[PDB]
């Protein structure tokens, strides 16, 4: 059954095997977020999206670091400035 020498394994099991549902759920959520990101990319974007990055705030009025775009008040002959 058990013993004092198995305290390591008992504690590890009791504390980690309950986490496995949550681990699989996290993996599934990540896969679904990747799917949605790739579907968005296939649909099309003004500025690119970095897939494996945490957050992508870039848009027509926003830099790739969350700040406003410089020199974005006017229009440009070659289109987007990026």
Binding residues for other proteins (CB under 8 A): 1-8, 10-11, 18-19, 21-23, 25-26, 29, 54-55, 57, 65-67
Chain centroid offset of residue 8 CA: 34
**Start-to-end Cα distance in the chain:** 65
Residue number, 22 or 77, with CB nearest to other proteins: 22
Q: In whole angstroms, how close is the CB of 29 to other proteins at the nearest point? A: 7
Residue number, 22 or 42, with CB nearest to other proteins: 22
Q: Distance (Å, rounded) from C-alpha 55 to C-alpha 74?
A: 27
Residue number, 1 or 46, with CB nearest to other proteins: 1
Phi, psi dihedral angles at 10 (to 5 degrees): -60, -50
């Amino acid at each position: 059954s058990t013993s004092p020498g198995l305290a390591f394994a008992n504690l590890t099991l009791l504390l980690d095997v309950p986490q496995l549902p949550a681990i699989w759920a996290v993996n599934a959520w990540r896969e679904l977020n990747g799917l949605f990101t790739e579907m968005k990319t296939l649909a099309g974007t003004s500025d690119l999206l970095y897939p494996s990055n945490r957050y992508n705030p870039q848009n027509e009025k926003t830099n790739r670091m969350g700040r406003p775009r410089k020199y974005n008040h006017g229009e440009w002959m070659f289109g987007n400035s990026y």
